[PDB]
Design a protein around this ligand. Structure first.
Ligand SMILES: *[C@@H]1O[C@H](CO)[C@@H](O[C@@H]2O[C@H](CO)[C@@H](O[C@@H]3O[C@H](CO[C@H]4O[C@H](CO)[C@@H](O)[C@H](O[C@H]5O[C@H](CO)[C@@H](O)[C@H](O)[C@@H]5O)[C@@H]4O)[C@@H](O)[C@H](O[C@H]4O[C@H](CO)[C@@H](O)[C@H](O)[C@@H]4O)[C@@H]3O)[C@H](O)[C@H]2NC(C)=O)[C@H](O)[C@H]1NC(C)=O
Ligand SMILES: *[C@@H]1O[C@H](CO)[C@@H](O[C@@H]2O[C@H](CO)[C@@H](O[C@@H]3O[C@H](CO[C@H]4O[C@H](CO)[C@@H](O)[C@H](O)[C@@H]4O)[C@@H](O)[C@H](O)[C@@H]3O)[C@H](O)[C@H]2NC(C)=O)[C@H](O)[C@H]1NC(C)=O
Ligand SMILES: C[C@@H]([C@H](O)c1ccc(O)cc1)N1CCC(Cc2ccccc2)CC1
Ligand SMILES: *[C@@H]1O[C@H](CO)[C@@H](O)[C@H](O)[C@H]1NC(C)=O
Ligand SMILES: *[C@@H]1O[C@H](CO)[C@@H](O)[C@H](O)[C@H]1NC(C)=O
Ligand SMILES: *[C@@H]1O[C@H](CO)[C@@H](O)[C@H](O)[C@H]1NC(C)=O
Ligand SMILES: *[C@@H]1O[C@H](CO)[C@@H](O)[C@H](O)[C@H]1NC(C)=O
Ligand SMILES: [W+6]
Ligand SMILES: [W+6]
Ligand SMILES: [W+6]
Ligand SMILES: [W+6]
Lengths: 374, 49, 383, 48
């Protein structure tokens, strides 16, 4: 009747937190906590997964911040993985990560807020800038999805090779367009490169609006980030302890619901000589995907169809005098502006209009017999 | 052309008239690889900016 | 000192003739290369992640394994995926020549050096469409799971259909989710939404058994319904599940003409030819990692250059080259059919973009719903 | 939609013959019969 939960966490302290969360789950079949810390490389990490965790027949594996080897290895058996802090969109692809859930939303879902922000400010014409990798394309697809769930359109989408230090061409491609609202998706160092080029290209002054995610206002990307930028931060997004607590509550709930059913088999123990999936794996997964915990430390924890956390709340943050200032929150479906006033990147404090129509419109025509003589 | 002059008269805007890079009007066609829907013609220039 | 010897580890899993394999890999001494292969056969029982990783890493720690030739007797694509992961992390050339390791894996790792002796999903799909052309099966539906490559499959079918003057009829496209359970009867309904007489099923063999079972429960396995599947569905022709429908057409590798020792020899020839072509174009070969525990430190010292020589190998007059995605460019394919005796029989062959079928008219059971009708050419009634 | 509850035939026929003898654009798309005497583990009812 003993159901093992596993975890790969940052420190022994967080291990003790996991242990105490599990103990509490027992307090509130009996669970036993089994955990390890991250290995130095992916092969050692996979092997650690097998020898230390799967060897104890874990029904599920909590993973904090490269969860990839753990997802692959556990997914080999269809043992579910709960990401505590990873936000990369690649883990949302059922094809690659078959049994992966996470208590945080992927970066790309920030697009929803961007969309709500466009509603919050009637921006009907926008330029999208994404990095030409998985996360960028995910964000593009997701925003085009939001735009073509309601006739809304992208004036242009620009993509850049990650690691490119001169992006002047792309931004010059964006100068020629009408739309003055600019949305960005990029890593830290790329956010830095775009912000730099942009400024050198004088696109950070009056008339321009810059709307971004979390990576584009984090660490070094902040050092060169223009002022008046609007960005997002996932609330509680970095408290590993809270997410361990909630993940453990959800997993315990799911375990008990699973064991409320019949014909439950145990998971595989050792790796050696076992090549069949955990038969109850997909059902346990179904249980997690459809688990509901109302009184969570990080708010209301539910998962969507990709196993991504739904109904996440974001702080809407504004850079004012090189200081990060909270101008609002994103709840579940609605934007809430607080008493602190937004200072935009540009002149005055009035909300700009991203629809500056050019005086020179390049008209195109074709040589037709009765209408257009050439 | 005269219609464009009329539009320029009603709504004041400078215009730079040009012909299509090809000889067609505007029809959607498949790409050379990865199967991507791309318009060719006047719309192919309108969508590309 | 002396012509340098590269370490090629030949891994064989299950029942395999090591004698015939070693006698066909040591006999034909190659002197046309700037490097000589040091073949070292190694056996392995289990095909789990830990066993494979441990065995390979130990094989690279003991000897200087420059290349790894892999073969198994199972039908586990997970083998190929694991091998791709190992080949990605250690930057070690790995060649899945048989079994589940040969089962195609779409969207490999960027730094992966794992190549497979099998046709691409796009190519297999194209062959399927060609079969549908040979017997005029224009109306069909496609059923795929979330297995890596379903997108490439369906997109290939669509791209081939759109740019054709042939009256193709793609009725239904199903995306069966095998990540969850099926207690809500979702799969049953999706399959119940099938109307086409020809169904293209793309999934794993283990998944294929379940899908065929449900389709049999609905009534899509009987006569009047022809299923066509890739290579990873059938797999081992000596192992046929009871759930597999009689009349199941499949595209597989020519295992009869392309033996296992020939496969090993060809793989060794590929790794060796690549090493030789690299040692004659840059005068060096990447040092074999003697540990899987320090592949994070010496990552800036390890390179992914052998690929441009592995992707392009001509041997003994045969073009054993690969593709960027990690599949064979010009594979010898064979069209097999599951008969009433529950066994696989070769009923077609695919070579050099040419399709040669065994029968002119596809042998369907002359039921009471199939008639032979004659007509005479007469305009405009019969043009 | 009906079950096997006695009357269902009287019902369906009453509809069919009210319809049939009318100059009105009635359109009966489906008539389902549900067997409540069996369990519904094969999801038949659901699919109907
Ligand atoms: C950051 O990004 C900015 C962009 O904002 C960079 O500024 C850009 O630099 C490029 C490169 O110098 C400028 O060049 C355009 O380049 C092309 C193509 O060729 C250049 O590269 C060739 C190799 O690919 C090289 O062979 C060329 O040299 C031969 O030819 C020139 C004459 O063209 C001759 O003078 C040389 O002696 C060589 O014989 C050349 O170096 C070029 O064809 C472009 O030209 C046309 O248009 C411009 C006006 O735009 C006109 O002045 C030209 O006469 C020509 O008609 C053009 O030069 C580009 O202009 C720069 N862009 C801007 C906005 O300044 C910047 O360098 C980057 N810096 C860093 C640190 O990353
Ligand atoms: C997070 O904060 C949000 C604040 O921005 C909360 O959203 C608000 O929720 C309240 C409570 O329901 C709403 O007030 C009610 O709105 C309904 C709906 O009418 C409006 O919307 C309909 C379409 O659904 C539209 O047709 C109408 O014209 C209205 O615009 C009314 O029926 C009630 O009378 C009442 O006004 C707010 O409207 C809503 N604000 C926004 C901006 O959406 C959200 O509930 C918070 N989340 C949680 C979990 O607390
Ligand atoms: C995600 C599934 C797979 O893609 C799949 C299977 C069935 C589907 O319906 C859909 C997808 N894989 C992921 C990787 C696993 C192998 C592995 C383990 C450890 C390290 C490297 C590689 C093996 C199983
Ligand atoms: C988690 O971290 C946040 C700080 O951002 C705060 O809620 C608190 O320090 C932690 N919460 C709990 C419940 O420990
Ligand atoms: C669960 O039920 C199925 C029959 O549908 C079968 O696998 C067996 O009866 C049960 N499994 C086990 C492990 O007992
Ligand atoms: C497993 O391998 C050992 C030697 O490596 C061999 O003796 C044994 O027979 C193998 N297992 C089976 C079931 O054949
Ligand atoms: C492949 O090898 C042949 C052998 O001469 C060579 O001609 C060809 O250029 C090579 N292909 C590539 C892409 O390097
Ligand atoms: W107690
Ligand atoms: W008690
Ligand atoms: W107790
Ligand atoms: W007790």
């Amino acid at each position: 009747k003993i159901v093992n939960i596993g975890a790969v966490l940052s420190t022994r302290k967080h291990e003790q937190m996991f242990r105490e969360a599990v103990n509490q789950a027992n307090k509130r079949i009996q669970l036993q906590a089994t955990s390890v810390t991250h290995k130095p490389n992916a092969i050692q990490m996979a092997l650690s997964v097998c020898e230390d965790l799967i060897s104890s027949q874990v029904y599920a594996i909590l993973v904090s911040h490269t969860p990839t080897p753990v997802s692959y290895t556990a997914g080999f058996y269809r043992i579910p993985v709960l990401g505590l802090t990873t936000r990369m969109s690649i883990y949302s692809d059922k094809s690659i990560h078959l049994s992966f859930l996470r208590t945080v939303p992927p970066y790309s879902h920030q697009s929803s807020v961007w969309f709500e922000m466009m509603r919050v400010y009637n921006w009907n014409h926008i330029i999208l800038l994404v990095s030409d990798d998985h996360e960028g394309r995910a964000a593009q697809k997701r925003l085009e999805t939001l735009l073509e769930e309601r006739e809304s359109k992208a004036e242009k989408v620009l993509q850049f090779d990650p690691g490119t230090k001169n992006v002047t061409a792309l931004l010059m491609e964006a100068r020629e367009l009408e739309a003055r609202v600019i949305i960005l998706s990029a890593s830290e160092d790329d956010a830095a490169t775009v912000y730099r080029a942009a400024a050198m290209l004088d696109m950070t002054g009056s008339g321009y609006v810059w709307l971004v995610g979390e990576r584009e206002i984090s660490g070094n990307a902040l050092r060169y980030a223009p002022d008046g930028i609007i960005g997002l931060q996932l609330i509680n997004g970095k408290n590993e302890s809270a997410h361990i607590s909630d993940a453990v509550g959800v997993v315990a709930q799911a375990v008990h619901e699973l064991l409320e059913k019949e014909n439950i088999t145990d998971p595989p123990r050792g790796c050696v000589g076992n090549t069949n999936i955990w038969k109850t794996g997909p059902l346990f997964k179904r249980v997690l995907m459809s688990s509901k915990y109302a009184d969570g430390v990080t708010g209301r924890v539910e998962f969507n169809e990709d196993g991504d956390r739904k109904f996440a709340q974001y702080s809407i943050m504004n850079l004012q005098n090189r200081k990060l200032v909270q101008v609002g929150i994103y709840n579940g479906t609605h934007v809430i502006p607080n008493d602190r006033k937004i200072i935009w990147p540009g002149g005055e404090t009035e909300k700009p209009r991203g629809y500056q129509m050019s005086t020179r419109l390049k008209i195109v025509t074709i040589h037709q017999e009765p209408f257009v003589y050439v | 052309i005269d219609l464009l002059i009329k539009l320029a008269r009603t709504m004041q805007f400078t215009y730079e008239v040009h012909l299509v890079a090809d000889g067609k009007f505007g029809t959607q066609e498949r790409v050379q690889n990865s199967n991507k829907k791309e318009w060719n013609g006047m719309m192919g220039e309108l969508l590309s900016g | 000192k002396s012509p340098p010897s590269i370490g090629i580890a030949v891994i064989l899993v299950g029942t395999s003739d090591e004698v015939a394999i070693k006698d066909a890999h040591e006999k034909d001494d190659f002197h046309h290369l700037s490097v000589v292969p040091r073949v070292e056969l190694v056996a392995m029982n289990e095909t789990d992640p830990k066993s494979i990783i441990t065995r390979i890493c130990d094989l690279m720690s003991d000897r200087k394994i420059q290349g790894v030739v892999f073969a198994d007797d199972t039908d586990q694509e997970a083998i190929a995926q694991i091998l791709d992961f190992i080949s990605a992390q250690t930057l070690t050339p790995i060649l899945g020549i048989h079994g589940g390791s040969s089962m195609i894996m779409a969207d490999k790792d960027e730094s992966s050096m794992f190549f497979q002796f099998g046709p691409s999903i796009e190519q297999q799909a194209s062959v399927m469409l060609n079969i549908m052309e040979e017997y005029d099966w224009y109306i069909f539906s496609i059923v795929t799971t979330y297995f890596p490559g379903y997108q490439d499959f369906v997109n290939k079918i669509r791209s081939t259909i759109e740019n054709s003057f042939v009256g193709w009829e793609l009725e239904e496209v199903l995306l069966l989710d095998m990540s969850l359970d099926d207690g809500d009867c979702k799969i049953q309904n999706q399959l119940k939404k099938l109307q086409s007489p020809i169904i293209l099923l793309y999934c794993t063999k283990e998944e294929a058994t379940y899908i065929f079972e449900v389709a049999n429960s609905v009534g899509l396995t009987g006569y009047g319904y022809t299923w066509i599947v890739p290579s990873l569905v059938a797999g081992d022709t000596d192992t046929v599940p009871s759930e597999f429908p009689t009349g199941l057409i499949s595209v597989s590798y020519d295992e009869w003409d392309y033996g296992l020792p020939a496969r090993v020899r060809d793989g060794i020839a590929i790794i060796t030819t690549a090493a030789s072509d690299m040692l004659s174009e840059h005068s060096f070969i990447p040092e074999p990692k003697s540990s899987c525990y320090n592949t994070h430190e010496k990552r800036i010292y390890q390179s992914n250059m052998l690929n441009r020589y592995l992707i392009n190998v001509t041997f003994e007059g045969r073009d054993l080259s690969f593709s960027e995605d990690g599949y064979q460019m010009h594979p010898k394919l064979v069209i097999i059919l599951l008969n009433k005796e529950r066994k696989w029989e070769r009923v077609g062959k695919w070579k050099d973009k040419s399709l040669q079928m065994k029968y002119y008219v596809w042998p369907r059971m002359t039921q009471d719903d199939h008639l032979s009708i004659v007509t005479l050419e007469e305009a405009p009634f019969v043009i």
